[PDB]
Amino acid sequence: MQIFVKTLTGKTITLEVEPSDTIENVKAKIQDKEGIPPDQQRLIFAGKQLEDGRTLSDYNIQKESTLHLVLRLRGG
Amino acid sequence: KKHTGYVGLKNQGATCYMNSLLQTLFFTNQLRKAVYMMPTEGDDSSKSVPLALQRVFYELQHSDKPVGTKKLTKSFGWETLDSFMQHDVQEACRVLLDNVENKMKGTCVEGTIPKLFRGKMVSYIQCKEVDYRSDRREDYYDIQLSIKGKKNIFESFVDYVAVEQLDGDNKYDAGEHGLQEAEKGVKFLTLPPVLHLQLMRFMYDPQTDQNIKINDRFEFPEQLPLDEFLQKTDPKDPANYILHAVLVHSGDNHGGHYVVYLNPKGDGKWCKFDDDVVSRCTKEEAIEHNYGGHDVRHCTNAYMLVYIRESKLSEVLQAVTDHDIPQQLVERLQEEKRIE
């Protein structure tokens, strides 16, 4: 199934995924297409940050759902 | 020193991201009031983020000295030797609000957080070479705004809702037509009473193979009209927003420092909250001076903005008094103080 990801410039990319794909798998597909290391990616969907170890089906992410990719500005 | 009337939060080194978030949420008065109503009587104080938030808010409301957050830090569980000490403020916001939202389910304050922060958008897709179209409605609790090449918030919203082409390696899967060139656009359906905007001040730099911060100039206004980005406007409730908070990051992707500028009452009287020190400042110091583009100033700029809808301001920023804090919670907190 094809989902959408909004990139760090606000452009929409497609990703081919399965409901059983984990968030880590999705981040790896983003790396393959956009080059962003997975350990820096964060994915937002419906106000929730998606968690490693869970699957797309866990969040009811379906064809044509849009995930929002962000990084981090760490501070203390 | 100019009276502020507000107390700071202790600087434990790595706490600044959470201190800045806590002030932002504390001065979302309608949320603060709901937090005080959460039924934490049976909560384990060493584990409960909701009780720890109540405690911090109670002390921000009552203490004359900088407030500590040790029990929130411990129960939130982010600053540890296995998970980093420095953190992203928008990440913290997403995780903290989800925790509190869950705790309020089934209580007299259920739904407070989505009522304050959740909006709805729609995405449309139309194929160019076959007759095939779709849409999908989705919720959001904040908006990620692109900044690279954009001069200001208005331009970022213009780009957010602008039609884009899905082609090349990003063709749309149009069911039995397979991959198809298509046009895609997003429109806002509603905008919430409290609008959180995350400025995407970062990018991957292939030249150094790493993520970097974008420190470019990017302007944001005190008054923000958003009706033109809605699919359908309401003549009785224009989407006019008023700037409430500027959460400022200094540093790079991998570390730095956070402060927050607020005008808590929405009246244009600003203060800077830098951990334990709260000081009056001018509008320029909170607004223009956080636009970026000074090439520490060169990497200090706004990261997260909070706007409140003008028609909701008197409710969102309603006064909070001791009448709003349940006696059972007051007694629990004083019990803790006396015990030490």
Side-chain angles (χ1 to χ4, degrees):
Chain A
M1 71 183 183
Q2 179 187 80
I3 66 171
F4 303 123
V5 179
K6 301 295 289 298
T7 70
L8 306 176
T9 55
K11 308 303 264 107
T12 300
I13 63 164
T14 58
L15 281 194
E16 181 62 30
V17 296
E18 294 297 335
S20 60
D21 275 335
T22 60
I23 306 308
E24 315 91 87
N25 293 348
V26 176
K27 293 173 174 175
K29 296 175 154 151
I30 295 170
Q31 179 181 33
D32 297 337
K33 205 165 183 177
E34 289 277 308
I36 300 168
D39 58 21
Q40 301 201 58
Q41 294 179 27
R42 303 189 289 123
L43 292 168
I44 310 299
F45 180 63
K48 169 96 216 307
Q49 180 167 302
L50 308 185
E51 296 187 69
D52 291 350
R54 294 190 184 168
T55 63
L56 295 178
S57 58
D58 288 331
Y59 295 101
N60 197 35
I61 289 163
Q62 302 177 69
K63 189 197 191 306
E64 301 171 10
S65 295
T66 293
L67 312 186
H68 304 271
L69 175 66
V70 299
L71 308 184
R72 291 182 177 92
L73 300 179
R74 294 187 185 278
Chain B
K1 190 185 137 181
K2 268 193 211 284
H3 168 82
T4 73
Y6 307 122
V7 73
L9 289 157
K10 291 186 195 183
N11 180 1
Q12 330 280 7
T15 41
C16 64
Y17 73 93
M18 179 60 76
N19 291 345
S20 299
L21 177 62
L22 287 163
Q23 299 286 9
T24 299
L25 297 181
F26 175 74
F27 292 115
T28 305
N29 292 14
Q30 186 167 9
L31 174 64
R32 192 208 309 176
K33 281 177 71 156
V35 161
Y36 289 143
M37 298 306 302
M38 290 185 306
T40 52
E41 297 83 353
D43 279 22
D44 177 349
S45 181
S46 68
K47 275 52 178 179
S48 174
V49 170
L51 179 61
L53 189 61
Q54 289 175 326
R55 183 183 299 103
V56 172
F57 284 0
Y58 182 84
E59 292 287 344
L60 286 173
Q61 185 163 331
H62 292 88
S63 181
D64 53 15
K65 291 179 172 279
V67 170
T69 75
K70 177 177 298 313
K71 294 176 183 306
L72 177 59
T73 305
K74 186 56 173 279
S75 63
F76 204 64
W78 278 24
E79 297 161 43
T80 84
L81 293 177
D82 297 308
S83 60
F84 304 128
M85 299 296 180
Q86 297 187 64
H87 289 287
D88 181 288
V89 72
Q90 182 271 349
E91 192 176 6
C93 187
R94 294 273 58 77
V95 170
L96 180 58
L97 288 179
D98 170 79
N99 183 294
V100 175
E101 182 178 344
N102 285 331
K103 183 65 171 180
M104 292 186 182
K105 289 181 178 177
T107 76
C108 62
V109 289
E110 63 186 355
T112 296
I113 284 166
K115 284 182 178 171
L116 284 168
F117 301 103
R118 187 180 66 201
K120 207 175 276 286
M121 61 182 77
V122 57
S123 296
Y124 289 100
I125 308 265
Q126 296 197 106
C127 290
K128 293 180 175 179
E129 301 183 321
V130 299
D131 183 5
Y132 194 96
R133 53 193 171 276
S134 191
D135 73 9
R136 167 47 106 30
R137 277 153 290 285
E138 292 172 313
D139 291 334
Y140 63 91
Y141 284 60
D142 62 358
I143 305 175
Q144 289 66 56
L145 292 180
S146 192
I147 71 132
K148 191 63 183 187
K150 309 211 203 296
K151 281 176 194 166
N152 57 46
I153 292 277
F154 173 77
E155 293 187 9
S156 192
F157 270 97
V158 164
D159 285 351
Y160 199 97
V161 305
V163 70
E164 67 187 301
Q165 302 294 333
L166 297 179
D167 53 30
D169 198 31
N170 295 298
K171 287 180 192 188
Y172 171 59
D173 176 2
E176 40 225 305
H177 298 291
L179 294 175
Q180 289 294 329
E181 297 197 3
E183 291 194 349
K184 177 180 172 281
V186 180
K187 295 203 235 298
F188 290 95
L189 298 177
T190 67
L191 292 152
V194 185
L195 181 62
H196 285 185
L197 306 178
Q198 180 184 12
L199 307 184
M200 283 194 300
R201 282 191 172 278
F202 30 54
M203 58 177 288
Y204 178 69
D205 177 13
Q207 162 158 318
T208 60
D209 176 47
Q210 69 195 342
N211 301 144
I212 61 175
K213 179 174 181 182
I214 298 169
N215 290 302
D216 298 3
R217 185 182 174 84
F218 181 83
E219 307 190 338
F220 52 91
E222 175 190 65
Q223 292 172 324
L224 178 61
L226 297 177
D227 258 4
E228 66 192 293
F229 310 109
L230 291 171
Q231 179 162 291
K232 182 178 177 53
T233 63
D234 182 350
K236 308 308 186 290
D237 187 1
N240 291 323
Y241 281 79
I242 177 158
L243 181 68
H244 193 230
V246 184
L247 287 82
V248 172
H249 177 268
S250 181
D252 63 25
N253 288 90
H254 300 301
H257 187 77
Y258 275 105
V259 306
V260 59
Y261 294 83
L262 276 134
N263 66 128
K265 294 189 172 295
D267 59 359
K269 301 276 193 106
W270 290 84
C271 293
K272 180 180 184 182
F273 294 74
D274 185 355
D275 293 330
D276 53 310
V277 181
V278 187
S279 54
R280 292 291 330 274
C281 64
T282 62
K283 290 186 180 191
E284 179 181 22
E285 286 168 326
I287 301 169
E288 277 85 358
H289 284 185
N290 291 313
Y291 284 0
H294 320 266
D295 332 353
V296 75
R297 295 295 297 232
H298 88 278
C299 65
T300 298
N301 38 62
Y303 178 38
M304 190 167 140
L305 305 173
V306 179
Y307 284 85
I308 298 170
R309 202 177 180 118
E310 181 166 41
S311 63
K312 301 290 181 183
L313 190 72
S314 68
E315 183 185 7
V316 175
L317 302 183
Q318 63 187 263
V320 186
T321 71
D322 287 335
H323 305 102
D324 298 310
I325 307 179
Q327 182 60 12
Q328 194 151 346
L329 176 60
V330 178
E331 291 172 348
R332 179 176 198 168
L333 298 178
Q334 293 168 348
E335 222 309 286
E336 299 177 346
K337 304 295 259 185
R338 61 175 291 283
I339 276 196
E340 55 171 348

